[PDB]
Scaffold this active site. Structure first.
Site, short mmCIF file in Angstrom:
data_model
loop_
_atom_site.label_atom_id
_atom_site.label_comp_id
_atom_site.label_asym_id
_atom_site.label_seq_id
_atom_site.Cartn_x
_atom_site.Cartn_y
_atom_site.Cartn_z
N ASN A 17 0.83 -1.18 0.00
CA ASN A 17 0.00 0.00 0.00
C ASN A 17 0.88 1.25 0.00
O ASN A 17 2.10 1.16 0.12
CB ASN A 17 -0.93 -0.02 1.21
N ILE A 18 0.26 2.41 -0.17
CA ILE A 18 0.95 3.67 0.08
C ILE A 18 1.35 3.69 1.56
O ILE A 18 0.64 3.17 2.41
CB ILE A 18 0.07 4.93 -0.19
N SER A 20 3.70 2.08 3.29
CA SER A 20 3.93 0.78 3.93
C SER A 20 5.41 0.51 4.08
O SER A 20 5.85 -0.64 4.17
CB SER A 20 3.24 -0.36 3.16
N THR A 24 11.71 3.16 2.53
CA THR A 24 12.62 2.73 3.59
C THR A 24 13.20 1.35 3.27
O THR A 24 14.39 1.19 3.16
CB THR A 24 11.92 2.71 4.96
N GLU A 93 10.43 -1.31 -7.21
CA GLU A 93 9.35 -0.84 -6.37
C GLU A 93 8.08 -0.79 -7.22
O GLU A 93 8.02 -0.07 -8.22
CB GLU A 93 9.71 0.53 -5.83
O1 BVD Z 1 -1.20 3.81 -10.63
C1 BVD Z 1 -0.85 4.65 -9.76
N1 BVD Z 1 -1.61 5.66 -9.41
C2 BVD Z 1 -1.17 6.50 -8.50
O2 BVD Z 1 -1.88 7.47 -8.18
N2 BVD Z 1 0.07 6.35 -7.88
C3 BVD Z 1 0.42 7.37 -6.90
C4 BVD Z 1 0.15 6.93 -5.48
C5 BVD Z 1 1.11 7.80 -4.73
O3 BVD Z 1 0.41 9.03 -4.51
C6 BVD Z 1 2.26 8.06 -5.71
C7 BVD Z 1 3.53 7.27 -5.40
O4 BVD Z 1 3.22 5.87 -5.43
O5 BVD Z 1 1.80 7.69 -7.02
C8 BVD Z 1 0.89 5.34 -8.17
C9 BVD Z 1 0.44 4.47 -9.13
C10 BVD Z 1 1.12 3.31 -9.60
C11 BVD Z 1 2.28 2.87 -9.19
BR1 BVD Z 1 2.55 1.29 -10.21
#
Ligand code: BVD
Ligand code: BVD
Lengths: 188, 182
Positions: A17-18, A20, A24, A93
């Site tokens: 998740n965001i 998580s 780090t 990542e």
């Molecule tokens: O599809 C996405 N949509 C999205 O909004 N994000 C956003 C979430 C966070 O704010 C920021 C860093 O992860 O990017 C990531 C992705 C995909 C990563 Br694969």
């Protein structure tokens, strides 16, 4: 037959998740820069697409900018997924799959992407898997409870409900259409 | 290295303005269905993307739908470009290149695609040429004057004409057969 077939080392995908602790957790690998291809979420690229900040616009005006943003994320992932490298191990990542299964999917649900936009991406996802080689040997799932995730963010701003939805999607995908082994970690 | 490399016959790309007799000119090849892979502009697909009519929405609401529509065109073209075939010759009506150089480019100018949407498509276009093999041996340009294309907005057709001109008369290299479609 596919692009970048046979041209890729063992590949590990760090998913979660965001907030998580993904960033780090990756810094710990940062000191093997020389034997590991260490590719971090190219947020830099999403914040500057030849000047334009897609990430901003996406949040600021979702119904309008979700589609191009996601399309662009999907691209940047592919570039990562397909980059050449002499290294014996590659670590990313996130990946194309989390873009497709967590973010696009959620944005469909809360109607950020209308039916037309979603279907275009999906036809593109379907095409891509036919054409481009996406090497994935192990996913490392940094599991968390939304509650916890939300805080790390309050520490360093998106709603708790949103993180909950992303959690459910990550859960559906990784615990319960992707086979290659999933190492579940506890990121609480 | 690229996808669909080595898997494609001699390929001819019929290019021209809207209403330059492209559809007519192709029907003449229609009687060799059996020796020719005859692939026409997949407008059917753009009109129905699993129920949704992208072409409609695009015209109806450009600033919103141009981006997905074009993205979808780009895909349908790639599917055509990369489709497998036993046939010794392949003929396509338009291509990825006219989507990129004529349609996307125009929509950029008349601000149908804003800077952020345009750039996404371009990055994609740049990526695609790195990754996917687009076989193109001969383009047949059905040249016309906007006026004529019209008699079959006019300013739109004029801009499309200038872009087709810039691209085909004056970056894509492989021989260009210019026909007069007046
Ligand atoms: O599809 C996405 N949509 C999205 O909004 N994000 C956003 C979430 C966070 O704010 C920021 C860093 O992860 O990017 C990531 C992705 C995909 C990563 Br694969
Ligand atoms: O990229 C495009 N964008 C576009 O708007 N069109 C429109 C013009 C006309 O209304 C109709 C017939 O092709 O489709 C075609 C293409 C073909 C690209 Br290849």
């Amino acid at each position: 037959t596919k692009y970048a077939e046979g041209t890729q080392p063992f590949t590990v995908l760090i998913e979660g998740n965001i907030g998580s602790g993904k960033t780090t957790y990756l810094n710990h690998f940062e000191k093997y820069k020389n034997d590991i291809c260490l590719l971090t979420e190219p947020v830099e690229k999403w914040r500057n697409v030849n000047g334009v900040n897609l990430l901003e616009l996406m949040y600021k005006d979702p119904k309008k900018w979700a589609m191009p943003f996601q399309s662009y994320v999907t691209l940047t992932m592919l570039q990562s997924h397909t980059a050449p490298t002499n290294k014996k191990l590659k670590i990313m990542e996130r990946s194309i799959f989390s873009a497709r299964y967590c973010f696009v999917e959620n944005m469909r649900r809360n109607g950020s992407l209308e039916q037309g936009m979603y279907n275009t991406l999906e036809e593109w996802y379907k095409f891509i898997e036919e054409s481009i080689h996406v090497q994935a040997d192990l996913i490392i799932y940094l599991r968390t409870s939304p509650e916890v995730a939300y805080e790390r963010i309050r520490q360093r701003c998106v709603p708790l409900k949103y993180l909950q939805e992303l959690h459910e999607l990550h859960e559906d995908w990784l615990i319960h259409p992707q086979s290659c082994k999933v190492l579940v970690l506890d990121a609480d």
